[PDB]
């Protein structure tokens, strides 16, 4: 069909937004390490 080339570019931007979820979860894990010593 048509109007699909624009959907392929959106899939690349979603990969950068999905990586932020792993970077945001790793930040909360760092503070959790302080609790072990708190």
């Amino acid at each position: 069909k048509k109007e699909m080339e624009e959907r392929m570019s959106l899939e690349e931007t979603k990969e950068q937004i999905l990586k932020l979820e792993e970077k945001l979860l790793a930040l909360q894990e760092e503070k959790h390490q302080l609790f072990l010593q708190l």
Partner: protein, 42 residues
């Protein structure tokens, strides 16, 4: 531990760093709206 106070101050500095990385994801999520709204338009 150390003094139940110097280690407590380190936990407040780590919480401020998570707000900066979390603020970047909120601005990137809104940017997806413009790209998702422009790709859905005819």
């Amino acid at each position: 531990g150390l003094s139940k106070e110097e280690l407590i101050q380190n936990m407040d500095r780590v919480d401020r760093e998570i707000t900066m990385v979390e603020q970047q994801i909120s601005k990137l999520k809104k940017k997806q709206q413009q790209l998702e709204e422009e790709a859905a338009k005819p």
